Short mmCIF file of C-alpha atoms and ligand atoms in Angstrom, two decimals:
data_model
loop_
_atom_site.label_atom_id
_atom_site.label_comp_id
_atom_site.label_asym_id
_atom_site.label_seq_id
_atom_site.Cartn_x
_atom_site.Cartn_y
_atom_site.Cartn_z
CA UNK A 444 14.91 5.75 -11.99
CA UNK A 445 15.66 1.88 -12.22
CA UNK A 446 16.92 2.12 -8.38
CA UNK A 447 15.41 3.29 -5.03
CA UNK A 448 16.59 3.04 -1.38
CA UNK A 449 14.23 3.25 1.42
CA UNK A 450 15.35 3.30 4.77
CA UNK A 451 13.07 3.25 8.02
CA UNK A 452 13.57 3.54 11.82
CA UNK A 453 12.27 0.81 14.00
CA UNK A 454 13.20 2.42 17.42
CA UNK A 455 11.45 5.95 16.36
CA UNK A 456 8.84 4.85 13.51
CA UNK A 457 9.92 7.32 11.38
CA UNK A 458 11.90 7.41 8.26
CA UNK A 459 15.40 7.15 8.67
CA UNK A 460 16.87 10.76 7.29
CA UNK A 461 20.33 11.43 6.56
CA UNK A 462 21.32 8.18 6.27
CA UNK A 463 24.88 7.62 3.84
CA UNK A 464 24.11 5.00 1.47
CA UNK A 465 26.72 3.78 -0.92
CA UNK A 466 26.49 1.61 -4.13
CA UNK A 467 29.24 -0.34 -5.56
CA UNK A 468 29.32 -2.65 -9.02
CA UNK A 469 31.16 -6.02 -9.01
CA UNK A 470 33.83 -5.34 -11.36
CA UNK A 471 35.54 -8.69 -13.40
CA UNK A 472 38.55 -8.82 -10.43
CA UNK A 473 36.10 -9.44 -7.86
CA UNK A 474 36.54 -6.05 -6.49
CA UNK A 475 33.51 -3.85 -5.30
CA UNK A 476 33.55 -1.00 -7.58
CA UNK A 477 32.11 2.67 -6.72
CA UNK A 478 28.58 3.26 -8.29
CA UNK A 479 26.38 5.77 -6.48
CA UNK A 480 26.04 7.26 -3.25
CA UNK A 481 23.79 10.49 -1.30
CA UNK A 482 22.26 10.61 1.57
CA UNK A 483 18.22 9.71 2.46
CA UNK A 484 16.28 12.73 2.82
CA UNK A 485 13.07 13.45 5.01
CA UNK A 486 11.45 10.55 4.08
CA UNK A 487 13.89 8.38 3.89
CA UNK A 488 14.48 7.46 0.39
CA UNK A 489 17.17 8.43 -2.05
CA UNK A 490 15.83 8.94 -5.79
CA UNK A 491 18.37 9.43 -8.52
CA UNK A 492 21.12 6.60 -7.62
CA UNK A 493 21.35 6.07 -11.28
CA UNK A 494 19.73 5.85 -14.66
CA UNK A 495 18.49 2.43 -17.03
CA UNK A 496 21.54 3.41 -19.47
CA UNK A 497 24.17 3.00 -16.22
CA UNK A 498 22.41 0.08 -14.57
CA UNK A 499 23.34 -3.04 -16.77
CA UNK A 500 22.62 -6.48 -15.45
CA UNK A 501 25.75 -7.91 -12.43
CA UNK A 502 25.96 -7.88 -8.97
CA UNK A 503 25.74 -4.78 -6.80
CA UNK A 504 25.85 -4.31 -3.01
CA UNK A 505 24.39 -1.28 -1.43
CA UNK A 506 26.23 -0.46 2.17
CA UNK A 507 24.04 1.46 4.62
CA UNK A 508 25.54 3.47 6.94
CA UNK A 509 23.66 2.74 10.09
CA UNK A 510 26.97 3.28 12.58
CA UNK A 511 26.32 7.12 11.69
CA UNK A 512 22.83 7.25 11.46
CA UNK A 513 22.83 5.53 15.10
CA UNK A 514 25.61 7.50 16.84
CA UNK A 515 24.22 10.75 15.60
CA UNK A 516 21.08 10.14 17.54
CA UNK A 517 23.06 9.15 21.00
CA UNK A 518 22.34 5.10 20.14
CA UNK A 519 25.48 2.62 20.35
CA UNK A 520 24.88 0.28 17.22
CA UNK A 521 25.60 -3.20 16.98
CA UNK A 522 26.56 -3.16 13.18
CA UNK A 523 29.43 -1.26 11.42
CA UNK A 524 27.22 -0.93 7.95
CA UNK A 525 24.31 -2.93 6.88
CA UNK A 526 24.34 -4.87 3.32
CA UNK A 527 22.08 -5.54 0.77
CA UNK A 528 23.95 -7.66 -2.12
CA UNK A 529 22.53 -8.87 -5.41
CA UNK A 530 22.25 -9.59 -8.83
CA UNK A 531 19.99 -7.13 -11.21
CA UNK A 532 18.67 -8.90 -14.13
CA UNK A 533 16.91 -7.83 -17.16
CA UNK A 534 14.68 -10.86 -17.05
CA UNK A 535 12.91 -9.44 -14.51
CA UNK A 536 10.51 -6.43 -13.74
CA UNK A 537 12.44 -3.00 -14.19
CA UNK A 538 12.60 -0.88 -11.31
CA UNK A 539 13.76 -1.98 -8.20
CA UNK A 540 13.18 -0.85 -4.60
CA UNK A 541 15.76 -1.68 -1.82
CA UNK A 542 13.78 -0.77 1.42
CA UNK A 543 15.59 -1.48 5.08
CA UNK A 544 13.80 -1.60 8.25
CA UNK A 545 16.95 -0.53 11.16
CA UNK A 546 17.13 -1.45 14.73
CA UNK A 547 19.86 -1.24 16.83
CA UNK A 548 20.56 -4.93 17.34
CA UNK A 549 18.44 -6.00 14.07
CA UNK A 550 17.69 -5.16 10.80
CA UNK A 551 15.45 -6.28 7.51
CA UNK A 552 15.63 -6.08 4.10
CA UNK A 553 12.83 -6.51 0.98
CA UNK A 554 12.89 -5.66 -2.51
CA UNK A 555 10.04 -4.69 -4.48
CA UNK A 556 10.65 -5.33 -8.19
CA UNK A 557 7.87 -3.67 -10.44
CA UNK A 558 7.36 -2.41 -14.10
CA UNK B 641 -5.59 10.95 4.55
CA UNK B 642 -3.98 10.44 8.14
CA UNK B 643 -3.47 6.16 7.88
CA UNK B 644 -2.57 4.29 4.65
CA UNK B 645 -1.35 0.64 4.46
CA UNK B 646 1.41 -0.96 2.55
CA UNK B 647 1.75 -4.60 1.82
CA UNK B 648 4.36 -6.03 0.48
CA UNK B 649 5.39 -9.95 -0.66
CA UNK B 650 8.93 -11.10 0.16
CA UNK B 651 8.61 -14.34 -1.60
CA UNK B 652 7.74 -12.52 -5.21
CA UNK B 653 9.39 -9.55 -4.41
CA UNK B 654 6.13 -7.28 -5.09
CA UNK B 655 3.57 -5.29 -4.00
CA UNK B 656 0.81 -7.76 -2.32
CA UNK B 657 -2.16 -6.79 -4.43
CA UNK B 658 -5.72 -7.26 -3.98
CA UNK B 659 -5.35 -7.99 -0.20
CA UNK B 660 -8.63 -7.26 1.98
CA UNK B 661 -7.55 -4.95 4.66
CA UNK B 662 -10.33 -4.30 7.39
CA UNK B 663 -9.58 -2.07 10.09
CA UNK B 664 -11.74 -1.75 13.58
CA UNK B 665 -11.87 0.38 16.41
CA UNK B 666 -11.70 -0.85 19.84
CA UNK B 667 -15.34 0.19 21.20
CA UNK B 668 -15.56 0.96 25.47
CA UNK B 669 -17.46 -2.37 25.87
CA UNK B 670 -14.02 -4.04 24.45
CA UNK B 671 -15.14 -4.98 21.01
CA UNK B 672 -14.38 -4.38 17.72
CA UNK B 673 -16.19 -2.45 15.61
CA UNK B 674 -15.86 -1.82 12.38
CA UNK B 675 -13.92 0.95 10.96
CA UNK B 676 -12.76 1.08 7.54
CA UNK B 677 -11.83 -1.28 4.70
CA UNK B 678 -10.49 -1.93 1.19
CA UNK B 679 -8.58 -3.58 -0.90
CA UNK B 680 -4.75 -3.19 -1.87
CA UNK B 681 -3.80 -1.25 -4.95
CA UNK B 682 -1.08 -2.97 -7.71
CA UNK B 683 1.54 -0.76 -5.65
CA UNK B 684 0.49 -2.84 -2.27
CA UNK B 685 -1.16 0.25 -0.97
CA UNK B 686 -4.49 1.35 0.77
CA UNK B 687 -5.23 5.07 0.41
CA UNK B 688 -8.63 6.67 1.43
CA UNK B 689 -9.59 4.59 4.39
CA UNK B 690 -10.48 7.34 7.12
CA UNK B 691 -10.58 11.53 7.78
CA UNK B 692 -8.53 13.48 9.90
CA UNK B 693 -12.24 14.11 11.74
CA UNK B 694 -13.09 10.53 11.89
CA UNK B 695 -9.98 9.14 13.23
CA UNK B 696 -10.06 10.14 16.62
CA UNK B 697 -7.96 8.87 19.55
CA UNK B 698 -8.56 5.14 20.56
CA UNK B 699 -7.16 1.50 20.35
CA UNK B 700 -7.27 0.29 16.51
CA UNK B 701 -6.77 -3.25 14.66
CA UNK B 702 -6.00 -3.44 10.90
CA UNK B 703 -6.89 -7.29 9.78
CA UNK B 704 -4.92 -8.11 6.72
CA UNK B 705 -6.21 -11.38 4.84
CA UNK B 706 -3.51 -12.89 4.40
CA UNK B 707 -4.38 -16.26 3.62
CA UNK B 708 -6.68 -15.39 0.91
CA UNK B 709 -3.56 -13.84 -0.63
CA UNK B 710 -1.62 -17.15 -0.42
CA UNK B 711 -4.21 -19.26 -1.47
CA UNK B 712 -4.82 -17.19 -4.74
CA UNK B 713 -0.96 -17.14 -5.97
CA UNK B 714 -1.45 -21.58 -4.66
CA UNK B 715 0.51 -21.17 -1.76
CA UNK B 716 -0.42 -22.67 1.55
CA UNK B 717 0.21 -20.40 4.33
CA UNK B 718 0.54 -20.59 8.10
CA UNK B 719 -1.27 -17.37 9.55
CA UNK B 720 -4.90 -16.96 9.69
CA UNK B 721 -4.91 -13.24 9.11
CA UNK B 722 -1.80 -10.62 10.08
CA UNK B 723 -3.27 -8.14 13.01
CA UNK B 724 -1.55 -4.94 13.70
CA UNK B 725 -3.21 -3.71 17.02
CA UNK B 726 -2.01 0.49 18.01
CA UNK B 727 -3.04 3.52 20.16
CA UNK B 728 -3.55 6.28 18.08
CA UNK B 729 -2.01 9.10 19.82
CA UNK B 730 -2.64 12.97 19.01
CA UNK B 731 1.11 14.25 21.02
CA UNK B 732 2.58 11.85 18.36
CA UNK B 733 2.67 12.94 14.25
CA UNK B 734 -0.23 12.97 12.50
CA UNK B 735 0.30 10.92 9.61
CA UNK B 736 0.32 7.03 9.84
CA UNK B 737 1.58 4.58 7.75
CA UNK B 738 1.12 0.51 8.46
CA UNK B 739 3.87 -1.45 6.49
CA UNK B 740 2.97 -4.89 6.78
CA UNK B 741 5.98 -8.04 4.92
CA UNK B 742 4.50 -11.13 4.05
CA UNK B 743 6.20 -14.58 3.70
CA UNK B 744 4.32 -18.14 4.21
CA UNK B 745 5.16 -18.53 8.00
CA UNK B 746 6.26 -14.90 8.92
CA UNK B 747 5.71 -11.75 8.77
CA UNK B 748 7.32 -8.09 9.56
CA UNK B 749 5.39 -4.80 10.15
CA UNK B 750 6.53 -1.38 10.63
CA UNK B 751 4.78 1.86 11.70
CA UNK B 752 6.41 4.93 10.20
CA UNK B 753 4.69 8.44 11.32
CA UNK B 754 5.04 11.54 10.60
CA UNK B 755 4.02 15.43 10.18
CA UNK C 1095 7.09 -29.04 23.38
CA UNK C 1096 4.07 -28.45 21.59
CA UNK C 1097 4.15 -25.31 21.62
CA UNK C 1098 7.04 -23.18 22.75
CA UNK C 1099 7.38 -18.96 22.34
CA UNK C 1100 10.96 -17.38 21.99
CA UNK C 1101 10.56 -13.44 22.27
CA UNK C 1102 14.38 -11.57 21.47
CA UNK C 1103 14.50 -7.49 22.23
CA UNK C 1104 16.41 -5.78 18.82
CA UNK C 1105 17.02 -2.68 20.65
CA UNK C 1106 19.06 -4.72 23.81
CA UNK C 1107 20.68 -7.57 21.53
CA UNK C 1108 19.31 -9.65 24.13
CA UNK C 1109 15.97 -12.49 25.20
CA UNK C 1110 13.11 -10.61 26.35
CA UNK C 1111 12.55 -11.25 29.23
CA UNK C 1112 9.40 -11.21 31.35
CA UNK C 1113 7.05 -10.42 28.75
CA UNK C 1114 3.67 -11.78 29.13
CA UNK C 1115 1.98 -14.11 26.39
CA UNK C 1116 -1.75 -15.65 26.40
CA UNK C 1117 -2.82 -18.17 24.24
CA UNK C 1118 -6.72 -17.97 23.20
CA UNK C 1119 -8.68 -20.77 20.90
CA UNK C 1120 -11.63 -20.19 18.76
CA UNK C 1121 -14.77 -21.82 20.62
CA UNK C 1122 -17.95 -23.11 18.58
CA UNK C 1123 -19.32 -19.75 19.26
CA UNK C 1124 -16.32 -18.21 17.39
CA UNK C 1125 -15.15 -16.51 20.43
CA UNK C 1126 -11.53 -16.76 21.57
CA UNK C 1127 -11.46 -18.87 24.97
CA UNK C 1128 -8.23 -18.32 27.18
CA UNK C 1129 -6.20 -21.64 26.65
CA UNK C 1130 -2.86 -21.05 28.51
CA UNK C 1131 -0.48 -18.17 29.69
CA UNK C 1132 2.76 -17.64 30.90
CA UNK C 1133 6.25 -15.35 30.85
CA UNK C 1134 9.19 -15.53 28.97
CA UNK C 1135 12.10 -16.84 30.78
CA UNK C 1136 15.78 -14.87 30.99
CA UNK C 1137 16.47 -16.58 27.87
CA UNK C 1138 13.29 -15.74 25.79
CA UNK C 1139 11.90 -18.65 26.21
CA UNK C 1140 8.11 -19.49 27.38
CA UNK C 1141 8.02 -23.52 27.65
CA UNK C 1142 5.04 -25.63 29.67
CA UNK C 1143 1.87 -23.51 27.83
CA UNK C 1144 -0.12 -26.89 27.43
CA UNK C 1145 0.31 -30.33 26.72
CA UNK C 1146 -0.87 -32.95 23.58
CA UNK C 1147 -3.69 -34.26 24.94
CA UNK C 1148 -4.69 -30.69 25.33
CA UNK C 1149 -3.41 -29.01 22.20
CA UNK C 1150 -5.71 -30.25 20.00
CA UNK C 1151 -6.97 -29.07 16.92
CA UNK C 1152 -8.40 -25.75 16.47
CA UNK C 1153 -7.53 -21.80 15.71
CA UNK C 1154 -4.85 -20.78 17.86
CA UNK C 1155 -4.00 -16.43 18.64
CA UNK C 1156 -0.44 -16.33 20.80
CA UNK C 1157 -0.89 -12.60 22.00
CA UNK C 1158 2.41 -11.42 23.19
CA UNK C 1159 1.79 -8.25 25.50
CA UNK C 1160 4.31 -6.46 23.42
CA UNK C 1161 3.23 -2.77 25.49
CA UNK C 1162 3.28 -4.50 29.06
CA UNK C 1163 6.63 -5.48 28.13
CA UNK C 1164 8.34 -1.88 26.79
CA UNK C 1165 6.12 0.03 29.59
CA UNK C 1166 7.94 -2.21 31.73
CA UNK C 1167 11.12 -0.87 30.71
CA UNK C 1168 9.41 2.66 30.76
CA UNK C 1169 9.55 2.68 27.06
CA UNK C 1170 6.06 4.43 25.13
CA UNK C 1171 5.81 1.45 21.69
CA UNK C 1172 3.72 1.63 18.80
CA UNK C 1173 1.78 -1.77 19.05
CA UNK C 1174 -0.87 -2.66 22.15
CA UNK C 1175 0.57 -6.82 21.52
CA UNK C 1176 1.76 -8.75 18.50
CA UNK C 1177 -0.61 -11.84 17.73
CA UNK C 1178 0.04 -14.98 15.49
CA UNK C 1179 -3.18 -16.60 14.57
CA UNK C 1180 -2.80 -19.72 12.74
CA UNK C 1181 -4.43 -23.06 12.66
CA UNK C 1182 -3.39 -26.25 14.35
CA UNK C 1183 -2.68 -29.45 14.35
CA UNK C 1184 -4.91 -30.35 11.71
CA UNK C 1185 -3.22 -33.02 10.54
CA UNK C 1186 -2.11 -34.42 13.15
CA UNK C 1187 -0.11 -33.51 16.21
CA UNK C 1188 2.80 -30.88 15.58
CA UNK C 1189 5.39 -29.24 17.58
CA UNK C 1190 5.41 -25.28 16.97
CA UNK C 1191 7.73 -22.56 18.06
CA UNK C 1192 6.53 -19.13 17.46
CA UNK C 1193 9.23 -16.65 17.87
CA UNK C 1194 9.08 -12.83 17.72
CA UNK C 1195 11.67 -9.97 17.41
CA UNK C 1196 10.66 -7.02 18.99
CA UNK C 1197 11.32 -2.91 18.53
CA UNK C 1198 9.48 0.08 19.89
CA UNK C 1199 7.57 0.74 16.43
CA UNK C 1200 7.65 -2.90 14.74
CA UNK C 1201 8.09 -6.48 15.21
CA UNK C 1202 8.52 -9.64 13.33
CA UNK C 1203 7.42 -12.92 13.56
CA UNK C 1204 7.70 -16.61 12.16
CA UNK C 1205 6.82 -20.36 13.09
CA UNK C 1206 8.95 -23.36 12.77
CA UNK C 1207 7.01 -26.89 13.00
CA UNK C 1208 8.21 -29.60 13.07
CA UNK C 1209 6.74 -33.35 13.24
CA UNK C 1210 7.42 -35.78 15.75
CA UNK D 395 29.13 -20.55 21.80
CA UNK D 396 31.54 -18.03 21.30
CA UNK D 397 29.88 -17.38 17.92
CA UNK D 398 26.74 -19.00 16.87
CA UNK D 399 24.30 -19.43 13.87
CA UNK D 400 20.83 -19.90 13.28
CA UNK D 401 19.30 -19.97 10.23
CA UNK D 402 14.93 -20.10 9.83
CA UNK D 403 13.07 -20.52 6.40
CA UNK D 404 10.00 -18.39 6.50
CA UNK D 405 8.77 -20.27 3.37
CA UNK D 406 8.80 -23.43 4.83
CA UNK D 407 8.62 -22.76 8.67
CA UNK D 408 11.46 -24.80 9.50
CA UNK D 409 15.20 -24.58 10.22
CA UNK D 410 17.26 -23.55 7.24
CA UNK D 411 19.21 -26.93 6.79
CA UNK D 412 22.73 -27.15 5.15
CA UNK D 413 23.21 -23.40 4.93
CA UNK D 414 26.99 -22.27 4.20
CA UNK D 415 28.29 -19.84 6.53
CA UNK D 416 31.43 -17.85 6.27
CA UNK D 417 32.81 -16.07 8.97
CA UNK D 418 35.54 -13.33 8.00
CA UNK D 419 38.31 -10.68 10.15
CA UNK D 420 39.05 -7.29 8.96
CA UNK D 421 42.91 -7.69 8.85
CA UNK D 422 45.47 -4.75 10.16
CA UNK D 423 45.48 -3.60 5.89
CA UNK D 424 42.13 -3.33 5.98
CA UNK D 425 41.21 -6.34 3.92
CA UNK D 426 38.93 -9.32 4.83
CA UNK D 427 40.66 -12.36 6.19
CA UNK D 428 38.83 -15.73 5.98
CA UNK D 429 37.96 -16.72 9.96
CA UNK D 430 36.11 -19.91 9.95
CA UNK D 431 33.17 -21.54 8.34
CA UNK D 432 30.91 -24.38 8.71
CA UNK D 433 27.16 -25.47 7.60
CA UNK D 434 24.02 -25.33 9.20
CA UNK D 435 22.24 -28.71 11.28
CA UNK D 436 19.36 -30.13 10.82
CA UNK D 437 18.21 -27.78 13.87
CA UNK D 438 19.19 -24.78 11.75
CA UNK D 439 22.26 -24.34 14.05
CA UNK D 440 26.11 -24.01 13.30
CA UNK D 441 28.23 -24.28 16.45
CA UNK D 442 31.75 -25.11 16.47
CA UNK D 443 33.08 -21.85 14.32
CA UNK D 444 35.61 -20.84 16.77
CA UNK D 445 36.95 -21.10 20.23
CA UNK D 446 37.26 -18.23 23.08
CA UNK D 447 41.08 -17.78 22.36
CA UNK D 448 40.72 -17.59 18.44
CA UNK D 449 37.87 -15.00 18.53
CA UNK D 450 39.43 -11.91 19.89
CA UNK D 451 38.65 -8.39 19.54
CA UNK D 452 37.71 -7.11 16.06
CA UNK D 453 35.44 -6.79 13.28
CA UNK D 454 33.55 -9.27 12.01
CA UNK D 455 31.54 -10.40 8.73
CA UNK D 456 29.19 -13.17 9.13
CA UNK D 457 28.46 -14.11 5.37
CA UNK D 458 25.56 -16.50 5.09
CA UNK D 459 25.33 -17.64 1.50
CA UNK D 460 21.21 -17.09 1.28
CA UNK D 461 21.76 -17.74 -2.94
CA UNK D 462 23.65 -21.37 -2.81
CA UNK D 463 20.59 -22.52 0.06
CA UNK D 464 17.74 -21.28 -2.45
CA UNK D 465 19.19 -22.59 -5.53
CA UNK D 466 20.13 -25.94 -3.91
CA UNK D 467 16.47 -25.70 -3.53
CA UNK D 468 15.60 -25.14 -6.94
CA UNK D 469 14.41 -21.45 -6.47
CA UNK D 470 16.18 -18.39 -7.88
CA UNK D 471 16.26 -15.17 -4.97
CA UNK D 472 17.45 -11.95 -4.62
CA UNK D 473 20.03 -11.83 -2.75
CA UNK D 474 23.70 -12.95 -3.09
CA UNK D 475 24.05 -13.73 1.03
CA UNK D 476 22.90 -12.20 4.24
CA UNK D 477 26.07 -9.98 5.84
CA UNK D 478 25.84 -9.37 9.51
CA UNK D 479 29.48 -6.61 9.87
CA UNK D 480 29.91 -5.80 13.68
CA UNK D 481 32.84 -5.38 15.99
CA UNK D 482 32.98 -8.00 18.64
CA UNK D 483 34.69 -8.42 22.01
CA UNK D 484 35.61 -4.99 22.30
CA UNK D 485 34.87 -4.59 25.87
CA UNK D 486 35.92 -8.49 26.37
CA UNK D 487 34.66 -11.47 25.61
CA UNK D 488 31.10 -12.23 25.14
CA UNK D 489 29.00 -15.02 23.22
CA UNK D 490 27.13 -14.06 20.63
CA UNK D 491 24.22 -15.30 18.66
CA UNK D 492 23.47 -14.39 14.75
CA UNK D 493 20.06 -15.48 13.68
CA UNK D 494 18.64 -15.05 10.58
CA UNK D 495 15.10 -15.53 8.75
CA UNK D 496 15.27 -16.11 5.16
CA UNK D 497 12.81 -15.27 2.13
CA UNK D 498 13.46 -15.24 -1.14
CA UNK D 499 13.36 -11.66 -1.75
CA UNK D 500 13.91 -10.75 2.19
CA UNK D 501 15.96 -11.45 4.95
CA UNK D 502 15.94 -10.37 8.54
CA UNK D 503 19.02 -10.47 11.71
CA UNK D 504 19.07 -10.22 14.60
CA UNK D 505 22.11 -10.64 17.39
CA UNK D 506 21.81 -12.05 21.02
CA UNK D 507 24.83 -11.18 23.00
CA UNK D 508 25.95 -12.44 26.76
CA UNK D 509 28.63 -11.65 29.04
CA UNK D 510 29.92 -14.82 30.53
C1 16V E 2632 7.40 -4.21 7.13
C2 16V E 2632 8.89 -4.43 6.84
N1 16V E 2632 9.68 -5.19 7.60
N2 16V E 2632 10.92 -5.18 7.05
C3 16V E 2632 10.86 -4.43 5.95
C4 16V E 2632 12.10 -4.18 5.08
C5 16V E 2632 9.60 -3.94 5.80
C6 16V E 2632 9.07 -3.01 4.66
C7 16V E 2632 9.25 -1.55 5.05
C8 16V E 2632 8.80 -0.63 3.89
O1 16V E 2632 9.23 -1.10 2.62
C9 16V E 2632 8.84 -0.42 1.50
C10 16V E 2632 8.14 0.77 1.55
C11 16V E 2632 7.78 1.37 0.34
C12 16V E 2632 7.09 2.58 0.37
O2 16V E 2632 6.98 3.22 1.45
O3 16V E 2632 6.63 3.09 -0.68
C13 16V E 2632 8.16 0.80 -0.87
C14 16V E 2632 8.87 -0.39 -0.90
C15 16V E 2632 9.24 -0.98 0.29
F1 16V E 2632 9.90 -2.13 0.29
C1 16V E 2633 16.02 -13.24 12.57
C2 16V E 2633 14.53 -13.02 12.90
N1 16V E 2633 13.85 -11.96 12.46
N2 16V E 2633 12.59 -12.06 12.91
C3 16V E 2633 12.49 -13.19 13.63
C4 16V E 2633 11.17 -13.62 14.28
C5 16V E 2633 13.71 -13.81 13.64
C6 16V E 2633 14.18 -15.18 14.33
C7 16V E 2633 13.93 -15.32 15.82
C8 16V E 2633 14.82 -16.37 16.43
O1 16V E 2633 16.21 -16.04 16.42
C9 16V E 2633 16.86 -16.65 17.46
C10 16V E 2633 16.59 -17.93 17.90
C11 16V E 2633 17.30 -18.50 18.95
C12 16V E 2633 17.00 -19.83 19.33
O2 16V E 2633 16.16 -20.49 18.67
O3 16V E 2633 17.53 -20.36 20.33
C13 16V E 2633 18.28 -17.73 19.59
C14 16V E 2633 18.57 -16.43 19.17
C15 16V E 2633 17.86 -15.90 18.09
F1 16V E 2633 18.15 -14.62 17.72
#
C-alpha cells in the first residue's frame, strides 16, 4: 500500500524478476531492524511490503539483492547488494515508489512520492 | 497499446506531468515524420499513442519537452528537449515501454519490453 | 576545453572506448550542420572537438553513436545514439563536459559547466 | 588512485563540492569497520582515501552522505547517502573509480576499474 519496489534490467530491458528485496527499520540503537521482504515478480515490482498502520515516519533502507539476481543469469556483478536509504515522512505525499534501474557495473535509483 | 511513456522528476520526486511527448518515424528519405503525440498524465504516463497495426518495424524518436517542463515549475534547465532514438524490432517482445528521469542537467532513460 | 565528452560502459566497469560522437549546430535554416567529430580515447575521453573562437553561440546536439559502439562489441542495444541538445554559450563563453553512462537498453547523461 | 571519488550535481551541472565520504571494511565478525574518509574538491574529486598496502582484499562500503551536501545547501532530499557495497581486490590489486550523480530524489553509480 504506502510502499512499492520496482526493479528494472538495464542489460536485458526487461523487468528484473525474482529479485530478493529486503526492508529494514532504524531502530533507537542504531541497528537496522527487519521490516519486509519477497521477491519481485514478472514485472518487477513487489506490492504488499507493508500497510499505512506499520509504516510510521523514521529511516528505512531497502537492500536489493542484485549479487543473485546477476549470478543467476551467468553475469559476474560488481556490487554485493544495492541500497536505497531514507527517511519517510508524513509531511509529505503518501505512497511511495522505490524504483531501481540495475547494471552490472551501475545502478540508479528514483522515488516517486504521490497521494 | 504496444509503446507507452513514463516520465518521471527526480528533483520533486513525482510523476512529470503535462509534458509534450511527440514521437516520429524515421521516413526512407531520412526524415522525421510525424508519428504520434500527447501529453503526460498526473501518473507521468502516455497511454494510447499508436496500434499494434500502425506500429510497424522502423527507426523511431520520442521528443520529450523538457524545457517547457522546467520552465513551468521556474526552473532553468540545460537540455533543449530529451530524444530517445530505437529500432523497433518484431523478434524482440511486443510491448514497449520508454522510461525517461529528469533532473536540470541530466537525464536517465530506460527501455523495458516485454510479452 | 570547451567542450569535452567522457563516455563510461556500466556493463565493463570500464571508459568506452572508441565510440564515435558528432557534434551538429542549428543553422538559420533550422537544420543541424555537422560542427565537429571524433572518438573516445582508452580513457573515455573525446578532447580537441573545436575551439572558442569556433564554439560560439548557438544550439548544440552531441550524438554519441551509442549502436556503432555495442555492434562493435557484437552486442544487439536498444537505442540507434544518445543525443544531448542544449544551448550554448549564451552568455558568454563556457567550458562543458557532457558525459554519458552507457547499457545495452538505457543510458544516462549530465553536463558540468563551468566558467573560465 | 587506489580508490577514488567523484561526485556531479545534476541540479546544478557542476561538481558536487565539499561532499563527505565514508569509506568502510566488513570486519572478520561481520560488522562494518570505519576505513577512511575525506571530502570532495572543488573538482568534485576525493583522492587520498587510502594507499595500495592499506586497501587489500575485501568488501567495501563507499557511504557518500547525499543528505548533509543537500541540506548544507538548504534543500531537504530523499535519501540518507548513496552506498556503493562491492568486494575489491579479489583477484589483486586494481584502482578503482566510484562516481556518482546526485538529485534530490535520485542518485546514480557507476565504477571504473583498472588493472595496473
Ligand atoms: C529512467 C530511469 N533511470 N533510472 C531510473 C531509476 C529510472 C526510472 C525507471 C522506472 O521507474 C519507475 C517506473 C514506474 C512504473 O513503471 O510505473 C513507477 C515509478 C518509477 F520510479
Ligand atoms: C554516475 C553517473 N551516472 N550517469 C552519469 C552520466 C554519471 C557520471 C559520469 C562520470 O563519472 C565518471 C567521471 C570520471 C571523470 O570525470 O574523470 C571518471 C569516472 C567516472 F565514472
Amino acid at each position: 500500500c504506502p510502499l512499492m519496489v520496482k526493479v528494472l534490467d538495464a542489460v536485458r530491458g526487461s523487468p528484473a524478476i525474482n529479485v530478493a528485496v529486503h526492508v529494514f527499520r532504524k531502530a533507537a540503537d542504531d541497528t537496522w531492524e527487519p521490516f519486509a521482504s519477497g521477491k519481485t515478480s514478472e514485472s518487477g515490482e513487489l506490492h504488499g511490503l507493508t500497510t499505512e498502520e506499520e509504516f510510521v515516519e523514521g529511516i528505512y533502507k531497502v537492500e536489493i539483492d542484485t549479487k543473485s539476481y546477476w549470478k543467476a543469469l551467468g553475469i559476474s556483478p560488481f556490487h554485493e547488494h544495492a541500497e536505497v536509504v531514507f527517511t519517510a515522512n508524513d509531511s509529505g505525499p503518501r505512497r511511495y515508489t522505490i524504483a531501481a534501474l540495475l547494471s552490472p557495473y551501475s545502478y540508479s535509483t528514483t522515488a516517486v512520492i504521490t497521494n
